[PDB]
Amino acid sequence: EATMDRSLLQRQDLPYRFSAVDLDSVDGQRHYRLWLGRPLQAPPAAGYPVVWMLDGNAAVGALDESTLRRLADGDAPLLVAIGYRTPLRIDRAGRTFDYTPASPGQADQRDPLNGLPSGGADAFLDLLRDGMRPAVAAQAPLDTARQTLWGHSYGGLLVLHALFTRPGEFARYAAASPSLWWRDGAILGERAGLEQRLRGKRAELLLWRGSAEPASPREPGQAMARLVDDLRRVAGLTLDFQPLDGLGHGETLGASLRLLLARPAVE
Numbered sequence: 390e391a392t393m394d395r396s397l398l399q400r401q402d403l404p405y406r407f408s409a410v411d412l413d414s415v416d417g418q419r420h421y422r423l424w425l426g427r428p429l430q431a432p433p434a435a436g437y438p439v440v441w442m443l444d445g446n447a448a449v450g451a452l453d454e455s456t457l458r459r460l461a462d463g464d465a466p467l468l469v470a471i472g473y474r475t476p477l478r479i480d481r482a483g484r485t486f487d488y489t490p491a492s493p494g495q496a497d498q499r500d501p502l503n504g505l506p507s508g509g510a511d512a513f514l515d516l517l518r519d520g521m522r523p524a525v526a527a528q529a530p531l532d533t534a535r536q537t538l539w540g541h542s543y544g545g546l547l548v549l550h551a552l553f554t555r556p557g558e559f560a561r562y563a564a565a566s567p568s569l570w571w572r573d574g575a576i577l578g579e580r581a582g583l584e585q586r587l588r589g590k591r592a593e594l595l596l597w598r599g600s601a602e603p604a605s606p607r608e609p610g611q612a613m614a615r616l617v618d619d620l621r622r623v624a625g626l627t628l629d630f631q632p633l634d635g636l637g638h639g640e641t642l643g644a645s646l647r648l649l650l651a652r653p654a655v656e
């Protein structure tokens with residue numbers, strides 16, 4: 390419903406400069422703009438570490454000047470906000486499709502919330518690998534062993550799908566207020582076999598949830614607590630759950646992103 394925040398983009402007085410890289414989905418239906426924030430600092434020998442953010446029209450709006458100045462500590466990351474070509478802060482249709490996994494059973498697969506087409510998670514993650522990273526790498530040197538993937542809500546659902554089904558693409562996975570309720574907890578089933586799929590890899594998972602969030606949009610915290618308890622047991626996986634006192638669902642997006650970017654950079 391609301392406009393995105395372009396102010397940051399056209400600014401010049403910070404230690405980051407932002408440029409756009411455009412791509413379409415393979416099926417031609419969805420239209421992306423990746424906003425690349427490049428440190429003024431020269432790349433490390435092995436390339437910049439990279440932080441990929443879903444809901445990027447929104448994520449750019451949540452990159453504050455204070456955070457951006459501190460990120461320039463001599464090992465600054467490349468920031469890649471994966472947005473949609475639209476004025477809006479949020480792209481309902483695109484994001485609903487791109488960030489939800491397929492539910493094998495269903496023919497026309499439709500979001501149980503807003504009824505839009507869903508189930509494009511794997512196509513999206515494939516496009517990240519096969520089209521986005523190629524384009525981003527051409528603009529700046531990347532350290533592909535030091536990559537972070539962040540998302541909020543359905544974006545967090547996506548992030549969990551990536552870790553659970555295709556672990557090791559990213560070093561750090563960061564899921565804020567992941568929509569665990571989706572399809573009566575369907576994402577929770579995808580976690581079966583994770584330890585086996587993680588063999589020979591090490592990965593970090595950061596989770597957030599706000600104290601004021603309901604269990605779904607229509608027993609708060611139970612699902613998350615059980616997921617955390619389970620994942621704590623997984624060899625190779627470092628888990629950090631951070632509850633956010635005083636926040637509801639919408640507000641955890643910005644909070645998680647600011648807190649993520651304040652963390653130590655990935656090894």
Ligand SMILES: C#CCNC(=O)[C@H](CNC(=O)[C@H](CNC(=O)CNC(=O)c1cccc(O)c1O)NC(=O)c1cccc(O)c1O)NC(=O)c1cccc(O)c1O
Pocket residue numbers: 390479481485502503541542543544568602603604605606607638639640
């Ligand atoms: C328009 C649009 C698409 N974007 C959003 O809805 C985002 C991010 N939300 C999500 O990605 C999903 C998916 N949301 C949508 O696709 C659009 N929302 C709705 O259709 C909706 C329907 C019934 C009740 C709701 O609260 C809804 O948001 N929401 C949830 O998982 C959710 C979880 C706990 C509590 C909630 O209120 C949640 O919304 N939500 C917000 O920014 C938000 C802001 C203030 C208050 C809110 O409740 C918000 O959801």
Ligand SMILES: [Fe+3]
Pocket residue numbers: 606638
């Ligand atoms: Fe909501």
